[PDB]
Design a protein around this ligand. Structure first.
Ligand SMILES: Nc1nc2c(ncn2[C@@H]2O[C@H](COP(=O)(O)OP(=O)(O)OP(=O)(O)O)[C@@H](O)[C@H]2O)c(=O)[nH]1
Ligand SMILES: Nc1ncnc2c1ncn2[C@@H]1O[C@H](COP(=O)(O)OP(=O)(O)OP(=O)(O)O)[C@@H](O)[C@H]1O
Ligand SMILES: [Cl-]
Ligand SMILES: [Mg+2]
Ligand SMILES: [Mg+2]
Length: 247
């Protein structure tokens, strides 16, 4: 046989490149996943991830309470934190023993898989009682924030998209929903009658994941890197696996 890495008959090499290219392109096909991660960062350095993976479109919807840090199996002062909730839903509305709950997120990162179309991204960043813009009567139920999403590049490939905002002020008390639609450069509408019921089933079939990792390092190591997910850390370092046309 020919010698490795010297000719056009390195079929092992060609197969490796095709395998990676096939995965990249499968993900972008209408058969493929689109994925959404919402990261809530807490002052103790831990990070809650909410993830949903689904065909056609994907979303996550959280309220003020559900974004709060919960240390499973440890003390969370649940009565005091209910009083925090009461005091955040209406000023002077509760009697907790604290001015600022350390269970409040300090920041949010939203990451989409590379198979999203950024023009379809919508976000409802609402107030603490789940209204998009102060009062329902004046609220558009979402903002289209795609122009703010940064490309996560690795080796010149877009491995995902990130929108990051800090919540450093005392009044940054939010509710949050996010939605994105899978790429569809074809004119075949996946939700027109020929395929519409499959999109309804995709709502059933969407797989969700949630966990609180003790720090960003642990998240990078045992979540992001373990499962070939895109990520952008606090030092603006990019994580992901470039696949298209690559060995
Ligand atoms: N493209 C390129 N890569 C370099 C160069 N010097 C060092 N590198 C390293 O080599 C890596 C790319 O090597 P290859 O993947 O084998 O070459 P390629 O440019 O991708 O071309 P292909 O054979 O089509 O894959 C990069 O990740 C760089 O870190 C250079 O001058 N050009
Ligand atoms: N020293 C080099 N000279 C020429 N081309 C390179 C070199 N290093 C990488 N490249 C090529 O340039 C393209 C972009 O790769 P690069 O490593 O810059 O991507 P990146 O990870 O987005 O970069 P960075 O995160 O450092 O800004 C890739 O196709 C890669 O093969
Ligand atoms: Cl397709
Ligand atoms: Mg009292
Ligand atoms: Mg290469």
């Amino acid at each position: 046989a020919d010698v490795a890495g010297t000719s056009n008959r390195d079929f092992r090499g060609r197969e490796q490149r095709l395998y990676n290219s096939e995965q990249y392109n499968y993900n972008n096909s209408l058969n493929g996943e689109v994925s959404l991660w919402v990261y809530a960062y807490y002052s103790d350095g831990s990070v809650l991830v909410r993830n949903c993976n689904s065909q056609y479109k994907v979303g996550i919807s959280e309220c003020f309470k559900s974004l709060k840090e919960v240390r499973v199996g440890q003390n969370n002062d649940p009565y005091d934190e209910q009083e925090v909730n009461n005091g955040v839903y209406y000023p002077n509305g509760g009697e907790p023993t604290k001015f600022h709950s350390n269970a409040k997120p300090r920041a949010i990162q939203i990451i989409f898989s590379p198979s999203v179309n950024v023009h379809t991204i919508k976000m409802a960043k609402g107030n603490s009682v789940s209204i998009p813009k102060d009062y329902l009567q004046r609220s558009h139920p979402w903002e289209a924030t795609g122009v703010k999403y940064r490309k996560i590049h690795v080796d010149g490939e877009i491995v995902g998209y990130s929108h990051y905002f800090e919540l450093p002020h005392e009044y940054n008390s939010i509710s949050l929903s996010v939605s994105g639609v899978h790429k569809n450069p074809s004119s075949y509408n996946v939700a027109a009658p020929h395929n519409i019921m499959d999109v309804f089933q995709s709502c059933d079939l969407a797989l969700k994941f949630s966990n609180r990792y003790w720090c960003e390092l642990e998240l990078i190591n045992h979540y992001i890197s373990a499962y070939a997910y895109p990520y952008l850390d606090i030092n603006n370092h990019k994580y992901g696996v470039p696949l298209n046309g690559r060995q």
